[PDB]
């Protein structure tokens, strides 16, 4: 019920290109011994969690 | 206290359907078209025809999708942060939106506003009629934003992070009006009640497992229930005051909740991977579930109104 803004082929190529450079720039440092970022994908066998 | 079938009425093969908690790759449009992201491809099924359309591939990975209000356009996110919009009738990519610098795990529409949330820590509001990639940026999570649900009737957004925090915003506003950080785990599964404005459901991950119901705009936790397993997805019944939660570790079920009493009505079994992907049919009768077991299951759960 409104008009979506539609890209020219050229407009897309600009957008893609800029994005790819912004993206490849921001190499941010991480802690490879910290599993937060992926915590919800560790099954409890891997969490190996609390007791004895 | 009413009868509810224990077996799906349709099972579709969904090869390559992701087994990643943070994805939710299955959406049923207001025009009755089911959209599903399988690895590097997106497929559509007409529920009325049984017709299958294969639009778009990527060298990357598809990572989120959300139908526009009217069901004419599909919004699609990628692992590299790119967000694109597809004209489904035309089968062409209408536009290509930058802004994110890391995967876009969640997307949500409020009419002409499209909103994306990413593993950079940002949420972006985008005027979809405008030539600008985005008009507002929100950095209120300190980890991946993995849940995002607009109200539309209320003018309210909910966001849920891997930082275990939930925020509620008034419209397109940069600062949240409310913050709930009780949960002890990721909050990806959240849903607004269509029956009562300002009511929000949120569900925690492995270390939390809780279903909480919040009365926003009065600031009260109306309910809080140990569901006993990781909550991975969620859907509020349109035709009835009931909630469906889908589960990960260590119970791969859907559970159907009453809401008036906060009691489980039924537990739906079958999936052999966590039930990560979930969506409600446009007529409100059917819930489709998906898992890394590469199946989509159709559960007839509700009646006409």
CA distance B64 to chain A (A): 17
Experimental method: X-ray
Yes or no, beta carbons of A26 and B94 under 8 Å apart: no
Yes or no, beta carbons of B129 and A5 under 8 Å apart: yes
Q: Which residue has the tokens 């949240």?
A: B176
Copy the structure tokens of residue A5.
């803004």
A50 vs B: CB within 8 A: no
Copy the structure tokens of residue B285.
């009768």
Is the CB of residue B236 less than 8 Å from the CB of residue B245? no
Is the CB of residue B216 less than 8 Å from the CB of residue B156? yes
Yes or no, beta carbons of A23 and B73 under 8 Å apart: no
Is the CB of residue B190 less than 8 Å from the CB of residue B201? yes
Interface residues of chain B, partner chain A, Cβ below 8 Å: 20-22, 69-70, 73, 80-82, 85, 87, 93-99, 101-102, 111-112, 119-120, 128-131, 133, 143-144, 162, 185-186, 188, 205-207, 230, 232, 248-250
Architecture of the domain spanning A1-52: Helix non-globular (6.10)
Q: In sequence order, what are the residues at sequence separation of 6 or more whose Cβ sits closer than 8 angstroms to the Cβ of residue B233?
A: B24, B188, B189, B245, B246, B275, B276, B277, B278
Q: In sequence order, what are the residues at sequence separation of 6 or more whose Cβ sits closer than 8 angstroms to the Cβ of residue B206?
A: A39, A40, A42, A44, A47, B185, B230, B248, B249
CA distance A50 to chain B (A): 11
Rounded to an integer, what distance in angstroms lies between the CA atom of residue B213 and that of residue B90? 41
Residues in chain B, overall count: 305
Yes or no, beta carbons of A2 and B248 under 8 Å apart: no
The domain ranges of chain B are 1-305
Interface test with A, best of B72, B88, B96 (most A CBs within 10 A): B96
What is the topology classification, in CATH, of domain B1-305? Methylamine Dehydrogenase; Chain H (2.130.10)
Q: Is B27 left (phi over 0), alpha (psi -120 to 50) or beta?
A: beta
**Full strand arrangement of the beta sheet holding B264-268:** B231-236, B243-247, B254-257, B264-268
Q: What is the resolution of this structure in A?
A: 2.9
Q: In sequence order, what are the residues at sequence separation of 6 or more whose Cβ sits closer than 8 angstroms to the Cβ of residue A21?
A: none
DSSP structural state of residue A36:
G
Q: Which residue has the tokens 């109104």?
A: B305
Q: In Å, how far are A29, B86, B204, B301 from B89, measured between CA atoms?
A: 43, 9, 37, 30
Rounded to an integer, what distance in angstroms lies between the CA atom of residue B297 and that of residue B275? 10
Yes or no, beta carbons of A36 and B143 under 8 Å apart: yes
Ramachandran angles phi, psi of B277, nearest 5°: -115, 135
Q: Which of residues 7-46 of A touch B (CB under 8 A)?
A: 7, 11-12, 15-16, 18-20, 22-23, 25-26, 36-37, 39-44
CA distance A33 to chain B (A): 16
Yes or no, beta carbons of B206 and A40 under 8 Å apart: yes
Copy the structure tokens of residue B33.
């078209």
Is the CB of residue B168 less than 8 Å from the CB of residue B178? yes
Count other C-beta atoms under 10 Å from residue B14's C-beta.
Answer: 22
Q: What share of chain A is helix, strand, coil (3-state, %, to 5)?
A: 50, 0, 50
């Amino acid at each position: 019920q409104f008009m979506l803004y539609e890209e020219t082929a050229e407009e897309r190529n600009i957008a893609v290109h800029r994005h790819n450079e912004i993206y490849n720039n921001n190499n941010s440092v991480s802690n490879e011994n910290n599993p937060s970022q992926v915590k919800e994908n560790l099954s409890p066998a891997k969490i190996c969690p609390y007791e004895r | 206290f009413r009868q509810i079938a224990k077996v799906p009425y349709r099972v579709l093969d969904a090869p390559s359907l992701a087994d990643d908690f943070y994805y939710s790759l299955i959406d049923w449009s207001s025009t009755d078209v089911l959209a599903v992201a399988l690895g590097k491809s997106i497929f559509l099924t007409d529920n009325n025809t049984g017709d299958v359309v294969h639009l778009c591939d990527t060298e990357n990975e598809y990572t989120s999708l959300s139908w526009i209000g009217a069901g004419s356009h599909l919004a699609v996110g990628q692992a590299n942060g790119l967000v694109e919009i597809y004209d489904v009738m035309k089968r062409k990519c209408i536009r290509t939106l930058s802004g994110h610098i890391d995967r876009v795990a969640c997307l949500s529409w409020n009419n002409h506003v499209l909103t994306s949330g990413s593993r950079d820590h940002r949420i972006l509001h985008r005027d979809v009629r405008m030539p600008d990639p985005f008009f507002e940026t929100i950095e209120s999570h300190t980890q991946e934003v993995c849940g995002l649900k607009w109200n539309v009737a209320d003018n309210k957004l909910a966001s849920g992070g891997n930082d275990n925090v939930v925020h509620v915003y008034e419209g397109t506003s940069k600062s949240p009006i409310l913050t709930f950080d009780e949960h002890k785990a990721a909050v990806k599964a959240m849903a607004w009640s269509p029956h009562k404005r300002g009511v929000l459901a949120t569900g925690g991950g492995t270390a939390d497992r809780r279903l909480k119901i919040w009365n926003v705009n009065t600031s009260i936790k109306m309910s809080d229930i140990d569901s006993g397993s990781q909550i991975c997805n969620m859907v509020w019944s349109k035709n009835t005051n009931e909630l469906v939660t889908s589960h990960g570790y260590s119970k791969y079920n859907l559970t159907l909740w009453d809401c008036n009493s906060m009691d489980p009505i039924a537990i739906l079994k079958g999936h052999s991977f966590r039930v990560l992907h979930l969506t409600l049919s446009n007529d409100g009768t059917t819930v489709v579930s998906g898992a890394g077991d590469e199946t989509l299951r159709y559960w007839k759960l509700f009646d006409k109104p």
